[PDB]
Amino acid sequence: MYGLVNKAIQDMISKHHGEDTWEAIKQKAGLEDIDFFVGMEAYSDDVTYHLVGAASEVLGKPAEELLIAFGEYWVTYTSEEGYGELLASAGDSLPEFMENLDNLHARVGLSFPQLRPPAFECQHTSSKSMELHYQSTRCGLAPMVLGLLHGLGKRFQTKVEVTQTAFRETGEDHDIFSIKYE
Ligand SMILES: O=C(O)CCCCN(CCc1ccccc1OCc1ccc(CCc2ccccc2)cc1)Cc1ccc(C(=O)O)cc1
């Protein structure tokens, strides 16, 4: 993924657990060679996976737990590192934000040609609920989506419940979430 993702992981871990832990996690992933991540440079996804994998081992938490937390961090981090207005441009509510997400990524992609954005499809079951279909070129990031959604709830001062109803790992086509929200 683009380096901003890896920069955000670094930032999250460094801030919550200190530099020495991050330096240890960086070493285990086998990325001691990389002196800093370049935010607008495309990396192999394995770099992200290896950082999550190594942080799971070093912190003694599951990777998925870390994905949830990172998903929550991402929404705040990007608002502060040059993406606040773009985020604002996608709306003042969770359902609106999700409807706008495919277009928000179209904007990013002009800038960044190797972007592999996920596809989202909303189906509004009420004015307080929706089912969300999540489709991706990447495997195992559903837990991050769960965090992202909870990041958005926090951003819009909204109570959000998210449950995954279908997983790519029970054989299903794509991930599907059920969402209820204030
Ligand atoms: O892949 C999967 O399954 C999904 C993994 C989730 C990754 N994630 C989900 C976005 C998202 C989802 C839900 C809610 C809020 C969200 O945040 C909105 C938002 C804000 C800011 C930016 C700046 C991007 C940028 C990238 C590079 C340079 C500058 C700017 C992007 C998006 C974004 C992402 C997608 C593809 C790539 C890539 O392909 O690398 C890298 C990152």
How far, in Å, is the centroid of ligand 1 from the Cα of 78?
A: 9
Residue in 22, 21, 39, 26 with CA at minimum distance from that of residue 80: 39
Residues 6+ apart with CB under 8 A from 170: none
Resolution (A): 2.3
- Sign for the pseudo-dihedral over CA of 4, 11, 76, 123: positive
Full residue range of the structural domain in which residue 156 is found: 1-182
Check: CB of residue 18 under 8 Å from CB of residue 37.
no
Q: How many domains does the chain fold into?
A: 1
Residue in 85, 106, 78, 91 with CA at minimum distance from that of residue 5: 78
Index of the ligand 1 atom closest to the CA of residue 83: 21
Q: How far is CA 29 from CA 37, 55, 107, 130, in A?
A: 14, 8, 32, 38
Q: Got the DSSP string for 20-37?
A: HHHHHHHHHHT-TT--S-
DSSP letter assigned to residue 79? I
Cα separation, 156 vs 163, in Å, equals 19
Residue in 9, 12, 7, 147 with CA at minimum distance from that of residue 69: 147
Name the experiment that determined this structure: X-ray
How far, in Å, is the centroid of ligand 1 from the Cα of 104?
A: 9
Check: CB of residue 168 under 8 Å from CB of residue 158.
no
Residues 109-134 as b or e (16 or more Cβ within 10 Å = b): eeeeeeeeebebebeeeeeeebebeb
- Sign for the pseudo-dihedral over CA of 84, 75, 151, 11: negative
**Structural tokens at position 170:** 């029970």
At 166 the three-state DSSP class reads strand
- Number of neighbouring beta carbons within 10 Å of residue 152: 25
**Structural tokens at position 78:** 């990007």
Give the CA-trace dihedral at 120, 125, 129, 134, to 10 degrees: -20
**Structural tokens at position 87:** 């985020």
Q: Domain containing 37 — which CATH number?
A: 3.90.1520.10
- Sign for the pseudo-dihedral over CA of 9, 42, 25, 66: positive
100 lines ligand 1 (CB under 6 A): no
State the residue for tokens 């901003």. 4
- Number of neighbouring beta carbons within 10 Å of residue 61: 12
176 lines ligand 1 (CB under 6 A): no
Check: CB of residue 39 under 8 Å from CB of residue 7.
yes
